[PDB]
Design an enzyme around this catalytic site. Structure first.
Site, PDB file in Angstrom:
ATOM      1  N   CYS A   1       0.921  -0.997   0.072  1.00 44.18           N
ATOM      2  CA  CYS A   1       0.119  -0.043   0.021  1.00 44.18           C
ATOM      3  C   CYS A   1       0.718   1.323  -0.062  1.00 44.18           C
ATOM      4  CB  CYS A   1      -0.897   0.022   1.208  1.00 44.18           C
ATOM      5  SG  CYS A   1      -0.256  -0.256   2.816  1.00 44.18           S
TER       6      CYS A   1
ATOM      7  N   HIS B   1      -2.179   1.729   7.048  1.00 47.83           N
ATOM      8  CA  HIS B   1      -2.391   1.227   5.573  1.00 47.83           C
ATOM      9  C   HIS B   1      -2.231   2.725   4.911  1.00 47.83           C
ATOM     10  CE1 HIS B   1      -4.156  -0.705   1.917  1.00 47.83           C
ATOM     11  NE2 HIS B   1      -5.139   0.087   2.077  1.00 47.83           N
TER      12      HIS B   1
ATOM     13  N   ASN C   1      -8.638   3.542  -2.322  1.00 49.88           N
ATOM     14  CA  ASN C   1      -7.967   2.442  -1.882  1.00 49.88           C
ATOM     15  C   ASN C   1      -7.398   1.662  -2.988  1.00 49.88           C
ATOM     16  OD1 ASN C   1      -7.018   0.534   0.002  1.00 49.88           O
ATOM     17  ND2 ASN C   1      -9.006  -0.193   0.690  1.00 49.88           N
TER      18      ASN C   1
HETATM   19  C1  LIG Z   1       0.044  -1.450   4.065  1.00 52.56           C
HETATM   20  C2  LIG Z   1      -0.733  -2.630   3.335  1.00 52.56           C
HETATM   21  O1  LIG Z   1      -0.352  -2.736   2.202  1.00 52.56           O
HETATM   22  N1  LIG Z   1      -1.818  -3.045   3.898  1.00 52.56           N
HETATM   23  C3  LIG Z   1      -2.717  -4.261   3.260  1.00 52.56           C
HETATM   24  C4  LIG Z   1      -2.048  -5.627   3.062  1.00 52.56           C
HETATM   25  C5  LIG Z   1      -2.149  -6.457   1.865  1.00 52.56           C
HETATM   26  C6  LIG Z   1      -1.838  -7.726   1.765  1.00 52.56           C
HETATM   27  C7  LIG Z   1      -0.611  -8.230   2.899  1.00 52.56           C
HETATM   28  C8  LIG Z   1      -0.332  -7.426   3.908  1.00 52.56           C
HETATM   29  C9  LIG Z   1      -1.224  -6.119   4.370  1.00 52.56           C
HETATM   30  O2  LIG Z   1       1.332  -3.115   5.415  1.00 52.56           O
HETATM   31  C10 LIG Z   1       1.447  -2.146   4.450  1.00 52.56           C
HETATM   32  C11 LIG Z   1       2.387  -1.097   4.907  1.00 52.56           C
HETATM   33  O3  LIG Z   1       2.951  -0.365   4.138  1.00 52.56           O
HETATM   34  N2  LIG Z   1       2.385  -0.899   6.208  1.00 52.56           N
HETATM   35  C12 LIG Z   1       3.414   0.121   6.874  1.00 52.56           C
HETATM   36  C13 LIG Z   1       4.018  -0.987   8.237  1.00 52.56           C
HETATM   37  O4  LIG Z   1       3.155  -1.373   8.768  1.00 52.56           O
HETATM   38  N3  LIG Z   1       5.250  -1.163   8.273  1.00 52.56           N
HETATM   39  C14 LIG Z   1       6.262  -0.402   7.390  1.00 52.56           C
HETATM   40  C15 LIG Z   1       7.716  -1.024   8.041  1.00 52.56           C
HETATM   41  C16 LIG Z   1       7.397  -2.223   8.914  1.00 52.56           C
HETATM   42  C17 LIG Z   1       5.847  -2.124   9.484  1.00 52.56           C
HETATM   43  C18 LIG Z   1       5.978  -1.615  10.636  1.00 52.56           C
HETATM   44  O5  LIG Z   1       5.346  -2.317  11.516  1.00 52.56           O
HETATM   45  O6  LIG Z   1       5.488   0.110  10.639  1.00 52.56           O
HETATM   46  C19 LIG Z   1       5.318   0.447  11.797  1.00 52.56           C
HETATM   47  C20 LIG Z   1       5.923   1.785  11.970  1.00 52.56           C
HETATM   48  C21 LIG Z   1       5.154   2.905  12.017  1.00 52.56           C
HETATM   49  C22 LIG Z   1       5.464   4.455  12.008  1.00 52.56           C
HETATM   50  C23 LIG Z   1       7.030   4.713  11.807  1.00 52.56           C
HETATM   51  C24 LIG Z   1       7.886   3.534  11.707  1.00 52.56           C
HETATM   52  C25 LIG Z   1       7.604   2.307  11.976  1.00 52.56           C
HETATM   53  C26 LIG Z   1       2.665   1.270   7.549  1.00 52.56           C
HETATM   54  C27 LIG Z   1       3.358   2.251   8.270  1.00 52.56           C
HETATM   55  C28 LIG Z   1       2.014   2.227   6.405  1.00 52.56           C
HETATM   56  C29 LIG Z   1       1.309   3.626   6.791  1.00 52.56           C
END
Ligand SMILES: *[C@]1(C(=O)NCc2ccccc2)O[C@@H]1C(=O)N[C@H](C(=O)N1CCC[C@H]1C(=O)OCc1ccccc1)[C@@H](C)CC
EC number: 3.4.22.1
Length: 251
Positions: free
Chosen positions: A29, A197, A217
């Protein structure tokens, strides 16, 4: 600023603004919200039309953007656009552009004719080559951004940015009740936290006295309201106003 604003209607000559993509079974995403908004802005600020490659962003940014299909950082994505640039690339099996998306579309929490999405997705390889038959070369097909910035957690400033420069990328906490969204203005009331997300915010409005953000989305068109959804605006609901990022294309 107007009471309502829809980037789709304000920039009729930029059809990518109306588009909804499908990230497939991959947590990309972060990359999609970025390439989608970037595609919109390239058209808005040089009105050329380019389907910016989610594949290029997803596979070649590397650590600077996070962890590919395991999630990434929106601001990091826009940085990649300014540093390495992005080639063109359309939908899966479209054969459009230098690097079309390589992950198949799937059903995101809805029934349909496509296979159901299965979270488990591996980040594709970073291949600095274009599909056969496409010109110019990978290097020559790069489109660069000349600025990458973050908009403050301020409703008015976010609206002003969209109003002037086009759709932006944002992120919010997804709870299970959001998965079943169909219409109206979404407000979280129940369900476990699914995680962050990233999405594309392209406007705002008011529905039944409830202010909202118009969001696109990346779960195909049979999810939500034709692929889009509205979420409560003005109260940083689910953090929707906490991580807005954007940038401007070169020249
Ligand atoms: C967005 C996504 O694609 N969601 C749907 C989906 C479809 C299929 C399989 C899994 C999920 O998980 C995606 C994303 O980019 N997430 C992103 C995230 O959670 N992280 C990025 C690095 C590792 C992880 C995390 O735990 O981040 C926490 C974080 C928050 C703030 C600052 C540092 C770290 C988020 C951040 C997107 C907004």
């Amino acid at each position: 600023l107007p009471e309502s604003f829809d980037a789709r209607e304000q920039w009729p000559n930029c059809p990518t603004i109306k588009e909804i993509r499908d990230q497939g079974s991959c947590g990309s995403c972060w990359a999609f919200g970025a390439v989608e908004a970037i595609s919109d802005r390239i058209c808005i600020h040089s009105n050329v039309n380019v389907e910016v490659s989610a594949e290029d962003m997803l596979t070649c940014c590397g650590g600077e953007c996070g962890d590919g299909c395991n999630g990434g950082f929106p601001s990091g994505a826009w940085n990649f656009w300014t540093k390495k640039g992005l080639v063109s690339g359309g939908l899966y099996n479209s054969h459009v552009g230098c690097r079309p998306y390589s992950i198949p579309p799937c059903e995101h929490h809805v029934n349909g004719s496509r296979p159901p999405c299965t979270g488990e997705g591996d980040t594709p390889k970073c291949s600095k080559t274009c599909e056969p038959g496409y010109s110019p070369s990978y290097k020559e097909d790069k489109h660069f951004g000349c600025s990458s910035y973050s908009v403050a957690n301020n409703e008015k400033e976010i609206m002003a940015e969209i109003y002037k420069n086009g759709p932006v990328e944002g992120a919010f906490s997804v709870y299970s009740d959001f998965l079943l969204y169909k219409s109206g203005v979404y407000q979280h009331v129940s369900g476990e936290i699914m995680g962050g997300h990233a999405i594309r915010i392209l406007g705002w409005g008011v529905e039944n006295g409830t202010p909202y953000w118009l969001v696109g989305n990346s779960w195909n068109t049979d999810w939500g309201d034709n692929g889009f959804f509205k979420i409560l605006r003005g109260q940083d609901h689910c953090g929707i106003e906490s991580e807005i990022v954007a940038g401007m294309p070169c020249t």
